[PDB]
C-alpha cells in the first residue's frame, strides 16, 4: 500500500540534482548499500556454520564497480587503495568495514564507518587526496547492525536515518533532519581506565556521579562499540568520549575513518565533536592511520568539559 | 564469501557506458526492480490477511521518481500517464503490473512485463510517442514471480536472467546470453478453445499428438499464465500460442505490453514470434491497448506452423 | 503485529486436544513443516546457490527425530525404511520429497506429498505396514512452493489451508474446512498423450471441447506439476486427470504417496478419486512403489466420466 | 542446504525421551519461540511499521494455546493469569516479554526473559504457584534481540544456545552444554548511581580500576538492558551488576522474572547468582513483583565481592 517509499537512492538522486552533477555519489551510496545489506544478513546468521576480512573485500569490491572512486583507505588495509583507471571517478572513501568486531560473538551492535571527500588536485591519485581536514568531508555516516540495520547519513543539508526494510532489500527514510539535544543525562565512557585519565576528564566524570549543585546524576552507558554508543548519543542526546589514557597517549580512535564522520555526524545534527584541545573536523592529517581523542556530543555538555579543560590548563 | 556478485545494477551501469549515455536507464531499471521486490514480497504473504491495483500504483511511482521517463503506458489506466516536466526523461515505458492475476489464487506463477522506447521527437510526449514498432523497443523484459523471483532483461547486447536474492534485496546475473533451442518437445496452448480455432493451428495440433512421420508425440503444457508459459518456452524450448479464437477475433493478447516485450526477448534469444500472418515486431500499432496474435517459440517448430499457415492460404 | 496468530501446531492442538489421543502426531507434522520450510528457501534461491536427494535426506532426518514414526516410504528409496528402535512411534509416513522435480528448472511450481497412516498391529515394523488402502489414512496434504508457499493438511474433520509466512517462519491458517466447488470449468490432462488415450478419456475430452447441451467448452490448463494442478483443482474446480495409456500402462502416478494423498485430500473436501474403475482409496496396495490411474476434482465431473467408463466396459 | 538440521524441538526431545517425563515441555518452549520470532521481526522493522504491550498479548496468547501452562506471571499484569480450565497443563512461566525496553529507539539491543517452574500443588491455580524459589525452576532462559536472535536456554543438563536462522524460521543449536570463565576482565554497573552505592560495592570498583595485585585494570561494559549484559558476561566473563541504592532501596531488578531466570542460567553454567547476602535461587518470594538486587557472573569474581560483603557487616 505504501506506493511512495522515500528508499535512499531517491533521496540521494533527487538532492545531487540540485547539485547539479555526474551522478557519481548516488551510484556509491547505491554499491555501498550492497556492502551494507550483506554484511547485515551475515552478521544474523553468524553462528550458524574472518567476518571483517570479507566485510571489506566486499566495500572494496562495491566501490571499485561503481566507477565512482579514485582513492580508498581501509582500517585493514596499510596503504591506500587506488582504483584502475577504467573504473575511476572523483570521490575518495575511507571506511571502517566491521567496526567493532571483537564484539561480535558477546552479540552486541557493530557498524560500518565512512567518510567520503572529494579529489581536488589534477595529479594522479594518492594518499594525499585522503590527507583533508575533516571540514572538508561532502557525505560522511555509519550503518548499524543492531537490533534493526541503520545507515545514518549526513551531507551538506543534513542528517537522515534510513532503515532497512529486510522484506525488500530497501533502505526506508525514517527519520529527516536529525537535530541532536541540548543538553542530555548519559555520560559514555570506560571507566576501567580510570587511573590513566588526565586531570579534566576525571573532573567532570566526579561532577557527572556526584552533582556540584544538588541536582540529579547522569545515568551512564558504554557499549563498548563506537557506533552504538554514537548513535545513542544522536538520539537520545548526552556525551561520548574516549579520551587519550596511556595504553593509548593518541587515543585509540583513528581518525579518516572513526573520528572524522562521526564527528561530521554530530556537527551536522548540532553537537560538538572534540579532542579538548581542538575541533576534530579541523585536524589536518598527516598519516591515513593515525588517531586522535574524541569528546562527541550535546553541545551544552561538550562545552563543559571543554571549561574543565582550561582551568586544569 | 561471494565479494564479486554481478547485480542487475551492476550490470546496467557497464552497459550504459559503453553507449555513452546519461544514465537514465540505469536509473530506470534500478526504480522497476524496487518496485518488482515489494510486487514479490506481497505475493509471497498474499493470503495473510485488489493486488494488482496497488502494483500498478508502485510501478507508476517508481517510475515516475526516477527522472527517466515521460510517457508510461499502463494495463489499468485507459490514457497513457505523461510525466510532469520537472520528473521527465526520454524513455517510453508500456507495462503490465502484474499479469495472470486472476490466477493468483490457484498459487501459480504470475509476473510484471514491460517494454522500454525511446521518445525520438521534438514536441510535447504525448501517447504517439508509445505507438511505435516493436523492433523499435531499446530493451524489454518481465519479472516472474514463480517458486523463486527472476528478471529476464533483454536489450540491443542479449537476453540475460537475474534472481532474487531475497536475503540481500539483489538481483543477481545467474544466466548469461540464453539463446533458446532451434527445436523443442512442448506446444503450449489452450485446448479448450479448439472449435474456434483456425484450420492451420488445428492442423498443426493435430501433427504435435499424431506425428506424421512415425515418430514421439509433443508433450503438452500450458499454465495460463503467459510470463510463466513464455519463460519455461524459452529455458526448455517449444512453441506457445494464443492464436485468434472468436472470443477474440484478434486475438486475447495486448501488442504493447505482452506480446512486443515478449516477441523482443524470444528473437534475441533466437527464436521467432509471429501472428502467422507477419512477425509482431514489425506490427505498427495504432491504438496502445491494441491485441495481436502471438506464436512465439524455438525457430523450427515456429516456422513449422508457418508453413501449415501458407498451404492453408 | 497480530497477537493472535494461528500456526499449524496451535491449531491441529486445537482438534486434538479434544479427542485425548495426539500430541505424538502434532510431534510429527511439526517435524515435516521444518523439512518444508527449509526446502522452500532451496527452491526460492535455487539458481543463486540433486535437490531432490538433499530434500529426501531432509524429509527422512527430521521424520525420524519426531519420535512419531516407524516406517517410511519414498519415491527415492526401494525398500521402505524401517526407524531405529529408539527412535520409534506409531505413525507410518509415505513421502514424495520434491514432486515434478523436472520442473524445477522452468521455474514452474513444485511441491511436497505425504500420505500418514497409523501402524495397526503389535509386530516389528515391515513395509506392509505401509500397504494399508488409503481409506486407512490418518492424516494427508502437500506442500506447494508456489508464488507463495502453501500447505494443505486434510484429516478426518476437513481440509486446511495454512500459508507460510516468510517473516516469522510459521504457517497461517488462511482458509478453513475447505469444499470444492460440485462441478467446475477446467480440465487438466496432457493431451500429447492424445493417441494413445483409451475411448472414454477421449470421448469425455470432446465434450468438453465441443459440448454436447451447448454451453461454453471447458478451459484447459496443464502446468505439468501434480500439486499445482490438484491444487488449483480443489479451489477453482475442475478435473485433474493422469490415466492409464501404454507407456504407462497400469498410470504413471504412482499410488502411495502421490494418488493417495491427493485422493484423501479431494475426498474430504467433498471431491471424487477414481481410477475410472475403482476408488483409489480402497485400492489394496501390492508394491511399495506401485501406480495407478488417477481421476479427480469435482464430484459432478468426475461422475461424467464415471458414466463413460460404464459405458465402454 | 543441512539435512542435519538440530533445532530447539529436536533438541530438547532428545533429552526429554531419555526422561519418559514431557513432551508437555517441548509443547510449551515450541510455543515459546513463535513468540520469539514474532517479536524479533517486529523489532527489525520497528522503525518502520506499545511494542511491550503486544509482546505481552503475544506471550500470554501462545502460551495458554501450548496446553501446558496454568500460572502466568507477566511484568505487565499485577496479578497472575490463571489459565482457562480447558487450556491446562502442569506449568508455571513467569516472563519479562521486553526486558530494557527504554533501550529500543536507540536501537541497543533487549529481550525476552522466562523462568518457568512445574506446579507442585493439587490444588487450584493460584499465584502461590508461582512463588517457589528459583532453586524450583525446571528450564528457564532468555532470547536476545541482538545483532542476531538467540535463544539461550537452561535446564538441569546445563545450558544451550541457539540462533534464529531468519531464511527457515527456526532456532539452531549453534554452542553446547556451555560453562563460563571462573574469571572475566569486565565489570558492568551504572556508576551514575556511585553516590547512592554502599561500601561493599565501592571497594570492590576500586579494586577493579586500580588493582591492589598490580595487574591490568578491569574494562568497564554497561549496555543498560539487562540480557545484552548478562549474555556478554556468560561469553566473556566478567561480573554484572544491580545491586541496591536507596532510590530503589531493595534492589531494582524484578525478582521472579529477572533475576531467577538470570541466576539460574548463570549457575547452570558455574557462574553465581547473590545479593550480597544470599543466593538469588533460595529467596522465597512474597510478592509475584518483589525486587531483588543482584550480582551474578565468574565464581572467582562474585567470590572476590562476596568477601568485601563479609567484611561490612
Ligand atoms: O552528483 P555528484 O556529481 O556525484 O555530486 C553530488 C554532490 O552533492 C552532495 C551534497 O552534499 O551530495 P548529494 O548527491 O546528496 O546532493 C555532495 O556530497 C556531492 O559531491
Ligand atoms: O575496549 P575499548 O578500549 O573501550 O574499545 C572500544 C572502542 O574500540 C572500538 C574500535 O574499533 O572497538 P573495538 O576495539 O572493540 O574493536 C570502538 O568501536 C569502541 O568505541
Ligand atoms: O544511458 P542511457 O542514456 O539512459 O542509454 C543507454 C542505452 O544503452 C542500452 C543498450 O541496449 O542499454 P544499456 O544501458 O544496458 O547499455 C539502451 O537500451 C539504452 O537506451
Ligand atoms: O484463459 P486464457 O484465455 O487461456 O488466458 C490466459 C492468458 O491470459 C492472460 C492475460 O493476462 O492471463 P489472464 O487472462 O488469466 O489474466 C495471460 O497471462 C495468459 O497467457
Ligand atoms: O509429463 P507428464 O507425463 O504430463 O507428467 C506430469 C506428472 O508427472 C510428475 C511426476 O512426479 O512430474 P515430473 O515427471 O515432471 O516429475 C507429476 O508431478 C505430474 O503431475
Ligand atoms: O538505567 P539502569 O538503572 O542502569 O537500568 C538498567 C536495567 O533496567 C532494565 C529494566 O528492565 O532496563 P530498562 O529500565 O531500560 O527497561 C534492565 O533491562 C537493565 O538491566
Known amino acids: 500500500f505504501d506506493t511512495n517509499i522515500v528508499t535512499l537512492t531517491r533521496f540521494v538522486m533527487e538532492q545531487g540534482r540540485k547539485a547539479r552533477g555526474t551522478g557519481e555519489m548516488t551510484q556509491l551510496l547505491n554499491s555501498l548499500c550492497t556492502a551494507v545489506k550483506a554484511i547485515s544478513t551475515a552478521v544474523r546468521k553468524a553462528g550458524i556454520a574472518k567476518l571483517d576480512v ?17 582513492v580508498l583507505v ?18 575518495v572513501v575511507c571506511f571502517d568495514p566491521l567496526d567493532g568486531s571483537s ?20 595529479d594522479e591519485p594518492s594518499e594525499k587526496d585522503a590527507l583533508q581536514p575533516g571540514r572538508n568531508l561532502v557525505a560522511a555516516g555509519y550503518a548499524l547492525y543492531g537490533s534493526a540495520t541503520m545507515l545514518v547519513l549526513a ?32 555520560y559514555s565512557i570506560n571507566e576501567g581506565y580510570a587511573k590513566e585519565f588526565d586531570p579534566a576528564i576525571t573532573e567532570y ?9 544538588n541536582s540529579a546524576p547522569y545515568g551512564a552507558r558504554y557499549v563498548g562499540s563506537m557506533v552504538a554508543d554514537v548513535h545513542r548519543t544522536l538520539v537520545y542526546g548526552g556525551i561520548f568520549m574516549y579520551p587519550a589514557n596511556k595504553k593509548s597517549p ?33 585536524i589536518v592529517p598527516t598519516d591515513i592511520h593515525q588517531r586522535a581523542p574524541i569528546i562527541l556530543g550535546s553541545p551544552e555538555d561538550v562545552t563543559e568539559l571543554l571549561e574543565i579543560y582550561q582551568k586544569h590548563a
Open 54 to 70: 570479507l566485510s571489506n573485500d566486499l566495500v572494496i569490491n562495491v566501490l571499485k564497480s561503481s566507477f565512482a572512486t579514485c
Open 74 to 91: 581501509t582500517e585493514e588495509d596499510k596503504n591506500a587503495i587506488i582504483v584502475e583507471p577504467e573504473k575511476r571517478g572523483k570521490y
Open 103 to 122: 564484539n561480535i560473538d558477546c552479540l552486541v551492535s557493530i557498524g560500518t564507518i565512512f567518510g567520503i571527500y572529494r579529489k581536488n588536485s589534477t
Open 155 to 186: 551531507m551538506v543539508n543534513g542528517v537522515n536515518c534510513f532503515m532497512l526494510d529486510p522484506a525488500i532489500g530497501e533502505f526506508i527514510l525514517v527519520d529527516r533532519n536529525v537535530k541532536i539535544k541540548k543538553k542530555g543525562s548519559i
Open 205 to 213: 566524570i566526579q561532577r557527572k556521579k556526584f552533582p556540584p549543585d
Open 250 to 282: 593518541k587515543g585509540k580512535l583513528r581518525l579518516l575513518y572513526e573520528c572524522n564522520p562521526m564527528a561530521y555526524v554530530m556537527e551536522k545534527a548540532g553537537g560538538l565533536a572534540t579532542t579538548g584541545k581542538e575541533a576534530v573536523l579541523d
